[PDB]
Design a protein around this ligand. Structure first.
Ligand SMILES: O=P([O-])(O)O[C@H]1O[C@H](COP(=O)(O)O)[C@@H](O)[C@H](O)[C@H]1O
Ligand SMILES: [Mn+2]
Ligand SMILES: [Mn+2]
Ligand SMILES: [Mn+2]
Length: 391
């Protein structure tokens, strides 16, 4: 095998400019890194610059270098949707025709009617909200009536909140499983159904750790599945395991923040493994993109960049580092949804003694999965073209 270990880092939502099909999505003008760079009066990301970020595209504070450490290009999304599961499933070798939906005005009456019909319970709420806001507003009514608080967020989720002393946990989980079946429908396709049990009294409600998530499996066996089946390590860091519903995962490391995610990446550098370490840095999307906070996003990018030199120092001759993103989420863009954007691709190994070069543009995110598959000699994905031989 060419590389013993591959470290794949998804900077979640870190897009590099509108894709050719952005107009279909209402995403003309979208530019996640570029708009952040402008807001920051120049982004400080010297380590990404050294890798060749500016060679992909020059932006404020992000300039090209004569001799990038590794290889660079961008990738274009081939699948229909710009959601979390589409982008990640494509990266690992799939093609997803049917996109996951978001619900800024709440769920269609038809879906909620059927959920009521199957459960024998009333549904209240039906809007995007934080768990705190919705409990303050409807927690007391929920307790008194035994109704279900159904709500969403900026991502593809259907959340069901019920008080633990009013709706037994087991009943709440049964209800969520019913909701999970009903939402396997392209009209209502949510990425995740989430049980949100809570306790307390009006003016003092708290969500309990008895939260359960109900995800869909990827629409195909992924490169991760093939790695696991061939006895390779597949270490998932952060949201990765959840995003693939555990498919192909041999070890999962939970993270609490981007800095904690980098700490776990460092932990995996310290592990003797053969296979894939796969990190998702989610704060970019979860705290800043959807909340349209370019300052916070910019600060987070600078915090991430400052962590990289330690990563560079630990990489071995037979390690490969891949840095990419799944979609965009431009923090200076209308609405609260993701943006359809190209994503950067940086590919670096200390064995690249003369530095890297420009790669042909990746026509699908599955090019990453294809590269990983070829490296480890496992079954090649149906989609994607390996760039292993170019490195
Ligand atoms: O908590 P996480 O990282 O699993 O994230 C979870 O909860 C968030 C809601 O946050 P709130 O608690 O403010 O309602 C949602 O945006 C997200 O889709 C969901 O996976
Ligand atoms: Mn848009
Ligand atoms: Mn994402
Ligand atoms: Mn998102």
């Amino acid at each position: 095998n060419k590389y013993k270990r591959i470290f794949l880092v998804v900077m979640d939502s870190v897009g590099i400019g509108e894709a050719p099909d952005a107009e279909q999505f209402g995403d003309l003008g979208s530019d996640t890194i570029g708009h952040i760079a402008e807001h920051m009066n120049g982004l400080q990301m010297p380590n990404m610059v050294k890798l060749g970020l500016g060679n992909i595209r020059e932006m404020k504070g992000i300039s090209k270098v004569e001799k990038p450490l590794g290889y660079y290009t961008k990738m274009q999304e081939k699948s229909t949707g710009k959601d979390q599961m589409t982008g990640h499933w494509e990266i690992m070798g799939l093609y997803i025709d049917t996109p996951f939906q978001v619900f800024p005005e709440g769920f269609p009456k038809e879906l909620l009617d059927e959920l009521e019909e199957k459960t024998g319970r009333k549904i209240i709420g039906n809007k995007p909200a934080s768990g705190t806001e919705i409990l303050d507003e409807l927690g007391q009514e929920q307790m008194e009536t035994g109704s279900l608080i159904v709500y969403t967020s900026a991502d593809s989720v259907l959340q069901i909140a019920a008080h633990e002393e009013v709706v037994p946990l087991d009943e709440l989980y049964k209800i969520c499983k019913i909701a999970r079946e009903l939402t396997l429908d392209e009209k209502y396709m949510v990425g995740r159904v989430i049980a949100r049990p809570f306790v307390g009294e009006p003016g003092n409600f708290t969500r309990t750790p008895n939260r359960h998530d109900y995800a869909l499996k990827p629409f195909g066996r992924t490169v991760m599945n093939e790695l696991k089946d061939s006895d390779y390590d597949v270490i998932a860091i952060g949201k990765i395991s959840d995003i693939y519903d555990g498919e192909g995962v041999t070890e999962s490391l939970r993270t609490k923040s981007n800095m904690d995610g980098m700490d776990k990446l460092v932990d995996t550098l310290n592990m003797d493994f053969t296979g894939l370490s796969f990190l998702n840095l989610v704060d970019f999307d979860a705290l800043f993109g959807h909340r349209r906070d370019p300052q916070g996003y910019g600060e987070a990018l600078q915090e991430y960049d400052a962590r990289l030199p330690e990563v560079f120092a630990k990489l071995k001759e037979d390690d490969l580092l891949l840095i990419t993103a799944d979609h965009g989420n431009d923090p200076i863009h209308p609405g609260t949804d993701h943006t359809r954007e190209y994503v950067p691709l940086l590919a670096y190994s200390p064995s690249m003694k003369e530095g890297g070069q420009e790669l042909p543009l990746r026509q699908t995110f599955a090019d990453i999965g294809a590269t990983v598959a070829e490296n480890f000699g496992v079954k090649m994905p149906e989609y994607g073209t390996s760039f292993l031989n170019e490195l």
